[PDB]
Design a protein around this ligand. Structure first.
Ligand SMILES: [Ca+2]
Length: 408
C-alpha cells in the first residue's frame, strides 16, 4: 500500500526545476530536455487548459528550446488548417493580421507573442532554417484553401480547371463552417463528400501533368485532403454519433503526420487531451490524435503534457461567454494535481518514463486529473481519470496559473 505523501517527495527529488515561465528568459533550465526528447521526430506539447497565461508562455519557451536546440522546424497548432495558412504567411513574410485568423479562444497576447517570435526567428539570417506554421484542425474549410487548388491547376494545367472549377464553387459556401454543412440534407452532404473525393481523385490521376513528384503538388494534394476530411466527418450518420469525434481526431492526426512526413521534425501544440498517448477525453472521443500518433510513431513520438494546481483560468461560463471564470480546486489528495502540487517548486518538469518504486506503479494506475474543457457545464466533467505514466512521457507542472490575456 503506497503512501502518496512519499510519492510527492520522490517527485521533488527527481523534478527538474524551471526558473520562470517568461518567454524571453534564458533557456538554460530546459537543457535536461535535450536527452529526454532524444531523436524523436514529433513531439506533442499539450496544454492543461486553453485559458491559462503561464501554460501558454511555458509552452512558448519549450518550442523556443526545441527549435534552436533540437532541430524542430514545424509547429502544428490545434487550429484550423485554413486559418493557419494565414499565420504561416505572417511568420514567413511578416504580412497579415494574425489575431484576425486565430480562433476566438486563442485570440490572446501570448499566442501573438509566440507568432511574433517565430516571425523574428525566420527573418534572422543567422538561423539556417525556418519554422513553418500548420493547422491540423478542420472546423471549417475557408476559400483560401480552395484558391490554392484553383491557382495551382490554372498555372500548371489550366485545361483541367473545368473538371474542378464549380465542384469547388459549390463546396465553398457549405464548408465555411460546420453548422452550414451539418444543416444540410443527408443526400446533400453525401454529394459534397463525392465532390471532394472527385477533386482529390482528379489531382491524383493528372499527377504527371501537374508536376506531381514535386513538393508543391504535395501541398495541393493535402489541401484537397482537408476538404474530404471536413465533408466526411460531417456526413456522419445519426446511428453512429461517436464517429464525428473519431473522424475529427483521425484527421488532426493525419494532418500532424503529413507535416512530419513531408516537412520534418514537428511540434504538435494542442490540448492535453489531443496529444496524450491515452484517451482522457473518452467522454466524447472514441480515440484521440495522440493515440494514432503513438500507434504509428512508437518511440518516434514523444508526448509532453502540462499540469496545474492552483489559480484561475479563462473558460466559457454558464452563459457561454469566455472569461476568467475558472478557479482551480485541487482538493482531492488522490489526484495528480494535488500530489504534483505538493512539490515545493513554482514550475518544474520530469521524465515520467524514468520513475521507480511505488511512484512508477502509481503513475500507471488511473487517478483523477483536471480535465480542462473549454466549457463549464452540468454535463461537462471538471476532472477525468487517467494513467499519467501512460498518457505522457514528460510532465511539466506549473503550481500557479492566471488567465490568458485575451484580446479586448
Ligand atoms: Ca481544444
Amino acid at each position: 500500500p503506497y503512501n502518496t505523501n512519499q510519492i510527492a517527495k520522490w517527485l521533488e527529488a527527481h523534478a527538474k526545476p524551471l526558473k520562470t515561465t517568461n518567454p524571453t528568459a534564458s533557456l538554460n533550465d530546459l537543457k535536461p530536455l535535450k536527452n529526454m526528447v532524444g531523436s524523436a521526430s514529433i513531439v506533442g506539447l499539450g496544454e492543461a487548459t486553453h485559458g491559462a497565461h503561464e501554460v501558454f508562455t511555458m509552452k512558448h519557451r519549450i518550442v523556443k528550446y526545441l527549435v534552436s536546440e533540437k532541430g524542430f522546424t514545424n509547429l502544428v497548432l490545434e487550429e484550423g488548417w485554413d486559418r493557419a495558412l494565414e499565420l504561416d504567411r505572417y511568420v514567413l513574410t511578416g504580412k497579415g493580421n494574425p489575431s484576425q485568423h486565430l480562433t476566438p479562444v486563442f485570440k490572446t497576447k501570448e499566442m501573438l507573442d509566440l507568432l511574433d517570435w517565430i516571425r523574428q526567428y525566420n527573418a534572422n539570417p543567422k538561423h539556417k532554417s525556418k519554422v513553418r506554421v500548420i493547422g491540423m484542425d478542420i472546423q471549417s474549410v475557408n476559400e483560401n484553401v480552395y484558391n490554392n487548388i484553383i491557382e495551382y491547376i490554372k498555372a500548371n494545367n489550366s485545361k483541367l480547371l473545368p473538371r474542378v472549377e464549380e465542384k469547388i464553387k459549390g463546396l465553398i459556401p457549405v464548408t465555411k463552417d460546420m453548422n452550414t454543412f451539418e444543416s444540410l440534407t443527408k443526400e446533400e452532404k453525401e454529394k459534397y463528400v463525392l465532390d471532394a473525393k472527385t477533386i482529390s481523385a482528379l489531382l491524383e490521376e493528372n499527377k504527371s501533368y501537374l508536376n506531381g513528384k514535386s513538393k508543391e503538388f504535395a501541398w495541393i494534394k493535402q489541401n484537397a485532403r482537408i476538404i474530404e476530411q471536413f465533408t466526411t466527418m460531417l456526413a456522419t450518420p445519426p446511428d453512429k454519433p461517436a464517429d464525428f469525434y473519431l473522424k475529427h481526431d483521425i484527421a488532426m492526426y493525419e494532418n500532424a503526420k503529413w507535416t512530419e512526413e513531408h516537412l520534418g521534425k514537428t511540434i504538435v501544440w494542442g490540448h492535453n487531451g489531443h496529444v496524450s498517448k491515452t484517451n482522457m477525453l473518452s467522454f466524447i472521443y472514441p480515440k484521440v490524435a495522440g493515440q494514432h500518433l503513438a500507434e504509428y510513431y512508437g518511440k518516434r513520438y514523444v508526448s509532453i503534457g502540462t499540469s496545474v494546481y492552483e489559480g484561475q483560468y479563462n473558460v466559457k461560463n454558464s452563459d457561454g461567454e469566455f472569461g476568467p471564470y475558472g478557479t482551480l480546486k485541487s482538493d482531492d489528495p488522490n489526484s495528480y494535481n494535488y500530489i504534483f502540487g505538493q512539490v515545493k517548486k513554482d514550475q518544474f518538469f520530469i521524465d515520467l518514463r524514468k520513475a521507480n518504486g511505488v511512484t512508477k506503479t502509481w503513475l500507471n494506475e488511473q487517478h483523477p486529473i483536471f480535465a480542462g474543457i473549454t466549457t463549464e457545464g452540468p454535463d461537462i466533467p471538471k476532472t477525468v481519470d487517467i494513467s499519467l505514466g501512460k498518457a505522457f512521457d514528460i510532465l511539466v507542472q506549473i503550481q500557479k496559473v492566471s488567465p490568458s490575456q485575451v484580446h479586448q
